[PDB]
Symmetry: C7
Subunit: 276 residues, 7 copies
């Protein structure tokens, strides 16, 4: 009996609280906002599916506990029958059958699509809008956290690898479903890795965009230095144009290279019912 | 009952409006026009096939709803039969069979072939004809949009992955047809990617052609600078010839490298009828 | 009935008129002439086989139309039988069997072999004989056209991919033969590509030969410049010899590298007869 | 009989005492501490599992000895029976069946997770905190020892490769379980190699971090040299900033590149019971 | 009947006269002579086997014609029988069986082995002996011709690809033997390619040997220039020695690198007899 | 009979005396000593196993000779029986069965493990301790000898490849066991190669260690040259330190790169008994 | 009958006399002598096995001739029987069975092992001992000859590829054994190639050794030039030492790189007996 309960406790091992949310700092770029919304919604779906997973972890626990509960009812009847036979009391009762319990529901969230064509931005406009925010440290730590959670899910799969001293049909069925939950949590670990990589692709391009896009300090240089003589003004407008071209170029590379693939987790294997 | 209706609603999820048309700006080049016509006709076929797809999405919805409608008729008869048996009224009626509903038709459009031999163009002719149009931003955004729609079709396939609590022959058949529509929409996503790539091949060559083909500013240079002394005039005609050779060379590379493969989408899997 | 006729019309879709002939301009080189004759004869065989193909396209059309004609005869008899049974006229007639129609013949053309050993040519001889012709633009456009026709045959295969609402043995047989004609036209598209590539190998070597073979302008230089002093005349003959060696070298490379493989198309799948 | 005992002695061959613990010296870095805790806990699990392994080595010994003990009981009865038959004493006794003995329990230890986001450190802070500890010699020798223990486990597997002159069902079963223990010890040798490699990945990054991270001697240089004139002070703050950036950069590389995979050993194959 | 005769004519298509013989010009080198003898004997065997091939081409023709002849005898008897039955003349005759005709014999030629060790030659000896002959143009054109004959045999295989309107056992057997002759002629085309390549290996080394071996003009230089002062005579003998070493070196490379593999053609598939 | 004896002699072919022992000269390095002990113990096991191999070579000889001896007993009885039947003496005797003979025992030697952490050595300490010994010529010749013995064992396998004119069950069994001994000796040849390679890995590192480790002559230079002025003494201690670092570095590389894998030979296939 | 005799003659085709012996000139090097002895003994075994091969070639000839002889006896009896039946003489005789003839024996030669450790040689000692012999021309021509004999054996296999007009069990058996002898001679051709390659490995190292080992002319230079002043004598001994080191180095490379693999030919397939 207790062996079932020990394993029920194992599959109830509290999942470590998952990674935190993703502020992206005041980086006023449409593309950055769209990529961020996609990363956040994928993260939300993962934490929603892990909640149902936890219910299934708990259902396997509960299935072990309600198999044990149902079997507790059976054992009380068996002990009663043994006392009736030992004492020689009254007519023995006919055999029957007993079931187990229930699961969880997942929220159907929306996904964010990017613009069919990003709006054209001015040089110093974009330089300023990128300049007022950060280096992407918030996203970077999101990616870091989400990546370290690969291993926490991978570690959590290990709670479903087996059970002690339990045989019948219910035992066989539970073994299979523990293995399914084991593998599923591992899969969620892999999905964790996938999203972390997508977050890294975005962060890598954020950095690339800051490295190549004209900086606000370059805008300051354009304001402080100025070749105002007529024939030199004819060179200034090209100076501006070269930086404007770099702005367009770099924002385009960000728009393309920061593209990411949506995460679509499978539902956790529903435990099936307990055989009697 | 409602489970069928919930899934019928899922497969009715409105497809996002598809990408817009392709102006190519006043770039007066025969080759550009032919490539453009091919890209447009392929896009038209894709949106035509997606309309029938949407009808099939709706037919799977409708098949679920008319399976449910037909079954609604069955359940009303069943409930009536139960009331007749409970009350002890009149003779029970003989069993029969009931079907479901219909689909959509695709337009057979023409496809555009290129010239068997492009016409020879003069240097400044071609320079001017390319110069008066744009950089291919319209086509580039077509390619961008069409490429982002890969993922919207890929996302839309997910509405056909399953159903809740429905068993019989009709249920089995619908599952298979939902999977077929799922995979087909995914295929259309892949065709979206294919066309976007063909549009990119054209756009890449458009850019290459502008980078290598003598520019109208080079024509301006040929008009403003002119080595008019006799023995130097004997060098001017070679200056002209070198640019004329580059014109021919580059237009030839455009003619070849901007070639593209026609898109030929398969029809959406027609849902088959509902079993009774 | 009409469904058969609609598909019969589809397989009658006029094949675009095939590419034009190959003048090679007055480039008086034996090797060029032999390569050209081989390319022309292969092109002739392809257009001859496509004519029988068109007859088979038409025979599949005609097979659909004469299946329909034969079935028209059957349906008139069936309708007549129904009127006889409805009215109660005279004795019903015994069942029988009805066939369909015919095909096309291909011309057995000769193929041209090259010389077992090309004749030795003089420097200025060969320079002049190459100089009087063109750059191979005619052949280049042949290759271009023949290559664009790959896609027109590949497009034409699509007219044989299917049929609507027709079942029996004749229907099954026609489906198979439509697929065979489909694939065959595709094969002809591939043969089109093959010949275009062989034409390109010849054109590439033509260009290479003009780039490396001493030009007639080099002959003009040899006539205008001349180191006539005795000990310098002893250097002139080596000048001549070096160009003569280049002539021999380059013509040899043309002779080898412009070699091409003969095209040998398979006959179009003959449609088999209509079952009754 | 003795052959069983000789092999029982073989599988009792004392396992060499395993590698020692891992002090990491006063290197006050959170990341170093977390990596160290993970390496230590993996080492503890390996030595815990090897203790149960040793019990199973001893159980195979004991299984051979208690098979021999049980068989000793059998042989005493057999000899007694032979004396009864030789002398012609009393009625022979009925045959029965005899079993064997028991195993070991493994401690369920906790595993250490790293921080979701490491804390930002100051230049000279981190330089000092790394500077006060060592070169990682303790960890390096841990890795060395743990790696040399690969071969001691690999050597210890060889004690379970076979047995002499023993046939029945018990013999067959023991052979299989000796092979399982053989292979398991080899597996533990491989796990030894795995952990040694993870320790090496940490040590390699420790060294890399010391090579690239600004040293305390660089901090001494920053304190001793100082361009105190106003416009040069405007360069000093950048000097500081460049080293601060290197500090951040290098600690980040340590945080990432010193990441390691947890070791999760399988339990030693439990010997099954002795057949009679 | 005529269909058999049409195909009999096809397989009689005259094989183009094969390539000519191989003079090697007065290049007095033992190695050159041995390589040449091997190439010639392989060529002779190929033309001998092609003669039997032509007999088998003719036998397939003849087998078609004598199947037709034998069948001609059968048809005359059949027509006679029909006239006897139509008129009602005399007793019908018993059925029997009729055969067909014969083939060709190949000459068993000797093959030439090279010397077990080539004789040592003097510098100017070898220079002169190579100098008096040509550049290997004769061999080069042999190789050219033999190589162009690959395609003539490959073309000739096509005459054996099929037959029109002929069914029975004899027809089936002939089809198989036509395919065998088809493939065999193709094989002979491949053997043609093989020998051409061996001839090319020899020709390539001939050229290499002339490029590296001291030329007779180098011998002329050694005779015209001569550092006759005592201590310079001590340098002249080394000048001689260096060229003598190059002579030995180069002749050795020719001896090795011009080695070639003997051609050993299979006999043409003998047509088997005609079934009645 | 004699055929068995001829083959018995073949399998008795004296194995060449195996390679000699491994002095490592007075190179006072712990690591060198440990590597040497491992190489020696592996060599001892190989020569111990080859002694049992030789017993099995001799047992196959002996099995052939005692099969022949046992058969000699059989043939004497057969000849006796023939004389009894020819003469008509007395009652024939009943048939029976006869066996063959025995094998060899291998010494269970200890294996040497390396230190869990090598002791830190001083610069000139280690330089001197390496300096007083040799270049590893003794080990090098051990490796040489052991490697040439690969081929002597490989040659010795050939004595077990077959037998002449011997049929029955005993013959079949012996053939199989000769093949097993053949292959085993080959395996021992491969083990010879393995150890030679391990000895070479050690010797290669010995050389590397002498090439990179500061030499005693470098110590002599450190004693003879000495920048004794105060501020130069501040450079001398760094001179010392650089060499001390090289000492540590190089000894560490020796410790790692001279690591080797223990040899573990399989026992020679025991010949099984002779069938009668 | 004659067809058997024609093929018997074919398999008797005289094998070309094999390559000659290997003098190695007075190159007084132990290693050279050992390598030479190994090459010679392998060559001897090959020519010994080819002699038995020739006996088997002759036995296949003889088997064809003694099958024919035995069949000659059969045919004389058959003809006699036919005359007895034609004339009506006396009682026909009972059928029986007739066999065929015999083979050859191979010499069991010794093989030469190299020294377990080559003796240390002095600089000028070794220089002189190499200097007094040749360039390895004798060995080189051995390798050349042995290599050209690859093709003579490969050519000789062709005499065993088939037979004309012979059917029964004996015919089938002979066909198989001719194919076995065919393939075996080919194998011997491959063994010829193998030994030639081993001879080439030795010759290549001989040359390498002469190129790198100090020459006797270098010894002459050491005797003629001599920096006799005290402090320069301290440089002379190093001059000597550098050449002595090169001597040791190069002789070691010869000792290793000139190592070769012994050739071990299989016996020629013994023809089996003729069936009657």
């Amino acid at each position: 009996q207790q062996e079932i309960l020990n394993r029920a406790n194992e599959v109830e091992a509290p999942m470590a609280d998952p990674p935190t949310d993703v502020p992206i700092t005041p980086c006023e770029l449409t593309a950055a906002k769209n990529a961020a919304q996609q990363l956040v919604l994928s993260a939300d779906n993962m934490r929603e599916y892990l909640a149902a997973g936890a219910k299934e972890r708990q259902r396997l626990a509960t299935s072990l506990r309600n198999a044990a509960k149902a079997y507790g009812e059976v054992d009380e009847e068996a002990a009663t029958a043994l006392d009736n036979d030992g004492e020689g009391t009254v007519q023995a009762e006919s055999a029957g059958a007993v079931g187990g319990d229930s699961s969880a529901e997942l929220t159907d969230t929306p996904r964010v699509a990017t613009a069919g064509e990003p709006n054209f931005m001015d040089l110093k406009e974009a330089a300023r809008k990128l300049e007022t925010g950060d280096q992407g440290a918030s996203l970077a730590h999101f990616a870091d956290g989400w990546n370290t959670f690969n291993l926490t899910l991978q570690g959590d799969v290990k709670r479903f690898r087996g059970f002690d001293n339990w045989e019948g049909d219910a035992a066989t069925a539970c073994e299979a479903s523990l293995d399914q939950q084991r593998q599923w949590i591992l899969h969620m670990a892999k999905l964790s890795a996938a999203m972390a990589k997508q977050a890294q692709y975005v962060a890598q391009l954020h950095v690339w965009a800051r490295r190549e896009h004209p900086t606000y300090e370059d805008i300051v240089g354009l304001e402080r230095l100025y070749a105002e003589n007529p024939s030199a003004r004819d060179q200034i407008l090209p100076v501006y144009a070269e930086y404007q071209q770099r702005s367009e170029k770099v924002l385009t590379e960000y728009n393309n290279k920061a593209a990411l693939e949506p995460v679509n987790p499978p539902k956790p294997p529903p435990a099936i019912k307990i055989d009697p």
